Amino acid sequence: FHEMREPRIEKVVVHMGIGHANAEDILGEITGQMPVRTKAKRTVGEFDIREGDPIGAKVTLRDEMAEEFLQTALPLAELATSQFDDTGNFSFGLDVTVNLVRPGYRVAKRDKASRSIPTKHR
Amino acid sequence: AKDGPRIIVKMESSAGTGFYYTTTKNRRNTQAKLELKKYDPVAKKHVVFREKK
Amino acid sequence: AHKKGVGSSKNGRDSNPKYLGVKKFGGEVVKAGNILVRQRGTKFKAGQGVGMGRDHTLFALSDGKVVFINKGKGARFISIEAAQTE
Amino acid sequence: PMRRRREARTDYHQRLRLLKSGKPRLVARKSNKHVRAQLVTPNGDDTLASAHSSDLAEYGWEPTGSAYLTGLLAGLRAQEAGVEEAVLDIGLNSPTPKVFAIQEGAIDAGLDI
Amino acid sequence: MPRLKVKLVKSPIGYPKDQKAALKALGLRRLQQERVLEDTPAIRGNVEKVAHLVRVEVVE
Amino acid sequence: SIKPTRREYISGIPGKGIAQFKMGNNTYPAQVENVVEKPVQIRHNALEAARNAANRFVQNSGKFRIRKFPFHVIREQDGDGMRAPFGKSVGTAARSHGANHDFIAWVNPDPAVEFAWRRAYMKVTPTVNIDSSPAGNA
Amino acid sequence: MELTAKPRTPKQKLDESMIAAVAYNKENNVSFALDRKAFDRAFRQQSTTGLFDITVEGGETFPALVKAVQMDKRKRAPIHVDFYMVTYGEPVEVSVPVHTTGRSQGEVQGGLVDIVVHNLQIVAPGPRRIPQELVVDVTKMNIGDHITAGDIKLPEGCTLAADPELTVVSVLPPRLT
RNA sequence: GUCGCCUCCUAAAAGGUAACGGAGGCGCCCAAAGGUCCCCUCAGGCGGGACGGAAAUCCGCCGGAGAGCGCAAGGGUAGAA
RNA sequence: CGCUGACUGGGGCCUGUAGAGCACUGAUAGGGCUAGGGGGCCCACCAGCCUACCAAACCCUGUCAAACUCCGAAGGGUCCC
RNA sequence: AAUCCCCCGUGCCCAUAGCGGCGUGGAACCACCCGUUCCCAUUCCGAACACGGAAGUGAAACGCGCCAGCGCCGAUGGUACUGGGCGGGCGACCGCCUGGGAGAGUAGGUCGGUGCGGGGGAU
């Protein structure tokens, strides 16, 4: 069946987030799927005690879109190594990650018979 | 009621005249001179309804 | 002119929950099963409960009344054979 | 959780919502490939294959019409039985334009909804 | 029609409420006396419970 | 069986203060041990102690294991006098349910430890039962 | 060895010289028989640690004996036992003991000792095929060492109805290491 | 010391009972925790990466809901409040 | 008013102590696996190394609970015959 | 059109259907799929919701079967507790007589069982 396991995209994010207005507007222009999420906590490791603020930025981008980005954005990054994490997936840079997509990935999405994703398929 | 100048203040609301009023408890807390809603005075039925008093 | 501490001492007051009409008696459009007032009655008997099965009340009229979760709101009708043609 | 509280997606209970009463569960089961609805009415009721995409073949008019008819007819088949005013059954998804379609059926179908 | 013939013993003096009724019930006036009935689990029951009460005899 | 006010409102959540369980040494078969029959909110302290003095007289190999441990407690004089009695705690233990698996003098041939425990019973309080286990004591 | 009974009489039975004990076997049971006197002797040997059987009407001379029971009662004198045979080649639930010797390492030199939360070994070798007395002791003992499942060392019959790393038997300070 | 009222335990298993017997809450509030119509699937743990080495933010798996619900408890209960 | 009443036989439907139980919770002991603090060693920004003292959490051997209970009777209740 | 095999909508019985290990199915079915002007639509993209349509595929969600490792179910004989009756001990309590009789504990058992309709599959 070698026509299975053999890959076919699957998500792939790329974001950022600072204890804050607009900076994500530089985010909008580079793609088109704005991320609006609220980080938090309550300490002074940066002055981020505020436990309920809007600073988390995350511009989701799988398939289609991500393609234009994987593309016009894959040249300025210089590495290709280690940064290779188990769960077929990896994260480099000012904040970006992308996940593998072996054939036994999805199922882990079902509300039912949620096969805890076997470790021989992924 | 127990008149407590504590964000606890009782008020009503006319019926554009529909004539009289109808019961209501309140709290400056927010929106001060704010208070509107419809009902129906002995006057036919319905009618805008400010609450201020 | 106040009150003290280190005397926990704090009796409790009264309630009055029940199953009134229990299961399978002369059914009268009145307070069905009780253990949560404001209750929202239902249709006939009830069988849903943090237990499993269900309960019939071979008694049928307008409706009864719930208790908020306990017992198990009615809906599984059950007028009773005593609801046919006179 | 209880069987229906660990999976996800359904709303069956938003079915039981109408369960209470109102009429036949003019329930409309969809599967793109086509649309299929029955008529679960209270008391361990049943149904009368009122309208199906196969019953009368699956035509070649896609969504649109399909419904437009499947319903109507459906509605036709039933009001022969002796129903009258039947309650709708969004079976699933949001009264999508399909849905809405079939819907029409009933309505136009003269089976009040 | 197993007919039962019981007698009176150990005065129910001060003994359990009901128990007594089972007394006046089965039909129990004065002391150490004898009465008879049909098996009838009913009547039966009562009496039995009364057990120690006195003595039962299968007669007719 | 009067017991306490709750496991976290009056007095519940402690270490009870004592001297842990195991001592002596292993042993696959030899069943050497001790249990009772008496009922008594086993006198903590008295308890803790006792058992211990047990080690005090032996030292090493003989399952100086011991399956007890108090965990609730009494109360009395503190405040006015005798009437409406609040409560001042002191002295927890555990119910020695009319007999049961006490502590174990468990090991091959080491009665030099049986006598021990023995010395252990002597002590204790509520009489005690001198015994053996599946097989006896070798 | 012998033991009889099986009607319907536990109280008196459960009394005197005869203690209850069901005739348990895969598929069928039969009133409790036995006796409060046999249990003794035999049991005394090593109940579910070896195995035999008794001749009641020559009926079925088979093994398996006890897979449950209890001297329960306070007194510590059993009453109401369980009995199950096995004339099959499936014998699994096999719990037979395992003994060391005394190999000198932490003891006769370090005084140190060792707990053996193990001792026994419920496994399942070659059904109706086990050495009533199996010994294994690679030795070793003292300091903060410990040995358990995992390592072990199983001969012939490759079962292990058990797991790895778990209550084997270590060496602790009978005083201090 | 303490007296009203809300919950637990005490009540021995319908209901319900003293004790100056145990412990703990309330004389608020919310105009939007209001009414419905439409969507959501929790805590947490694990694995991978910005500012981040407790403790986020996203991405991928596991989940009789143990999170969730202004307030004390207790019932509830995501189908969901 | 007149067989309706205490009581018994039958039939449903309930409560869920005693007991028991450890996956909810809070104890708590013997121990294994482990990382937090050690602790001795290259002198120790080394964050590399061994291991006899304290531990958190998971795993085995065990055990206490009125304000715990996946379990569950004695019995009592209530309508009908 | 008033019989069985199959798939599909789907209901009741609240795990003897769950977990997971291997496997099988695509003519039919169903999904994934192919695209995105207009219906509607994402606080970000038509991933999900969504309109139109072949090829491609059974990988995945899925349906039937085999596997007891985790679970879940769970007897008989059995011990506690006890309604009722009566005795011993100053004693905390012990026992007897009669009907009730669990959990855990070994056997073993389960990998659903069954409604109605629709498509076919059996002149």
Rg measurement of chain C, Å: 19 Å
The CATH architecture of chain C can be named as Beta Barrel
Sheet with the most strands of chain B? 2 strands, antiparallel
SSE order of chain B: EE
Question: What is the count of DSSP helices of chain C, taking H or I runs of 4+ residues?
Answer: 0
Strand content range of chain B: 5-15%
Task: Compute the number of structural domains of chain C.
Answer: 1
Give me the side-by-side strand order of the main sheet of chain B. Answer: 1-2
Largest interface: F-G, 16 and 16 residues
Structural class of chain B: little secondary structure
Number of helices of chain B: 0
Seen as an oligomer or otherwise, the chain set is part of a larger assembly
Q: How many DSSP E strands of chain B?
A: 2
Major sheet of chain C:
none
So, the CATH homologous superfamily of chain C? Answer: RNA polymerase II/Efflux pump adaptor protein, barrel-sandwich hybrid domain
Number of strands of chain C: 0
> Roughly what fraction of the amino acids of chain C lie in strands?
under 5%
Task: Tell me the helix content of chain B.
Answer: under 10%
Cα distance, first to last residue of chain C? 71 Å
CATH class placement of chain C:
Mainly Beta
Protein name (chain E): Large ribosomal subunit protein uL30
GO molecular function (chain E): structural constituent of ribosome
Family (chain E): Belongs to the universal ribosomal protein uL30 family.
Pfam family, one (chain E): Ribosomal_L30
Key words describing this protein structure:
part of a larger assembly; 7 chains; A: 122 residues; little secondary structure; 50s Ribosomal Protein L5, Chain: A; two-stranded antiparallel sheet; 2 helices; 4 strands; F: 138 residues; four-stranded antiparallel sheet; 12% helix; elongated; RNA-binding; ribosome; translation; release factor; 50S ribosomal protein L5; 50S ribosomal protein L33
Protein model, in words:
The structure is cut from a larger assembly and holds seven protein chains of seven kinds. With 53 residues, chain B is largely without helices or strands. Chain B has strands spanning 9-10, 25-26. In chain B, strands 1-2 form a two-stranded antiparallel sheet. Chain C has one domain: RNA polymerase II/Efflux pump adaptor protein, barrel-sandwich hybrid domain (OB fold (Dihydrolipoamide Acetyltransferase, E2P)). Chain C is 0% helix and 0% strand. Chain C is elongated, with a radius of gyration of 19 Å. Chain F is elongated and about 60 Å long. Chain F starts with 31 loop residues before the first strand and ends in a 6-residue tail after the last strand. Chain F has 138 residues and is mostly loops. Chain F has two helices and four strands. A four-stranded antiparallel beta sheet of chain F has the order 2-3-1-4, covered by helices on one side. In chain F, α1 (51-57) crosses α2. Chain G is largely without helices or strands and 177 residues long. Chain G is built from one helix and four strands; from the N terminus they run αββββ. The radius of gyration of chain G is 20 Å and the shape is elongated. In chain G, 20% of the residues are buried. Chains in contact: A-D, C-D, C-F, F-G. The F-G interface holds F 22-29, 37, 59-61, 98-100, 131 and G 74, 76, 97-100, 107, 111, 113-116, 119, 169, 174-175. Chain A binds three RNA strands through β1, β2, β3 and β4. Chain E: Keywords: Ribonucleoprotein, Ribosomal protein. Chain E: This is Large ribosomal subunit protein uL30. Chain E: One of its GO terms (biological process) is translation. Chain E: Belongs to the universal ribosomal protein uL30 family. Chain E: Part of the 50S ribosomal subunit.
